[PDB]
Paper text:
Infection by its etiological agent, PRRS virus (PRRSV), shows a highly restricted tropism of host cells and has been demonstrated to be mediated by an essential scavenger receptor (SR) CD163. CD163 fifth SR cysteine-rich domain (SRCR5) is further proven to play a crucial role during viral infection. In the current study, we prepared recombinant monkey CD163 (moCD163) SRCR5 and human CD163-like homolog (hCD163L1) SRCR8, and determined their crystal structures. After comparison with the previously reported crystal structure of porcine CD163 (pCD163) SRCR5, these structures showed almost identical structural folds but significantly different surface electrostatic potentials.
Additionally, a significantly reduced permissiveness to PRRSV-2, particularly HP-PRRSV, was shown in the PAMs with pCD163 SRCR5 substitution by homologous hCD163L1 SRCR8. MoCD163 SRCR5 was comprised of two antiparallel β-sheets (β1-4, β7 and β5-6) and three helices (a single α-helix α2 and two 310-helices α1, α3), whereas hCD163L1 SRCR8 contained two antiparallel β-sheets (β1-4, β7 and β5-6) and two helices (a single α-helix α1 and a 310-helix α2). A close comparison of moCD163 SRCR5 or hCD163L1 SRCR8 with pCD163 SRCR5 revealed that they shared almost identical structural folds (RMSD = 0.355 Å for 79 matching Cα atoms between moCD163 SRCR5 and pCD163 SRCR5, RMSD = 0.249 Å for 95 matching Cα atoms between hCD163L1 SRCR8 and pCD163 SRCR5). In addition to minor differences in the long loop region, hCD163L1 SRCR8 contained a shorter β4 (Ile842-Ser845) than that of pCD163 SRCR5 (Thr522-Leu527). In contrast, hCD163L1 SRCR8 showed a significantly different surface electrostatic potential from the other two proteins. There were more positively and negatively charged regions in hCD163L1 SRCR8 due to different amino acid contents. Especially, certain regions with the opposed charge were clearly observed, where the acidic residues were replaced by the basic ones. Based on the comparison, we hypothesize that the difference in the surface electrostatic potentials between hCD163L1 SRCR8 and pCD163 SRCR5 may result in reduced cell permissiveness to PRRSV-2 infection, rather than their structural folds. Furthermore, this comparison suggested that the surface electrostatic potential might lead to different cell susceptibility to PRRSV infection between pCD163 and hCD163L1, where pCD163 SRCR5 substitution by homologous hCD163L1 SRCR8 showed a significantly reduced permissiveness to PRRSV-2.
Author numbering: -1 to 0, 795 to 896
Write the structure that this text describes.
Amino acid sequence: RSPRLVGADMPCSGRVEVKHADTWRSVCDSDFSLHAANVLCRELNCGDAISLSVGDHFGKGNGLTWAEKFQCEGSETHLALCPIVQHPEDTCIHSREVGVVCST
């Protein structure tokens, strides 16, 4: 559940991608709370979250999109420690991949 931000002009902003096993997955913007964002920014040494950005703001990813969501409380040190839960019914397309801007 290793996270990275991809596609931004700086390391601390970009489209969210999180590794599971040997593949990376993006995260639908229907599925990602400000607390998951928070935890992500922290885990990445990027300060605290400023914004979640919709609509593949940093471009869209390709490949898998996470089918479970990270229901973080907010103070977890890693997304790994956040409880997970099923995505809502249907599927998302890459056009709704989520991104973040962390401060700092």
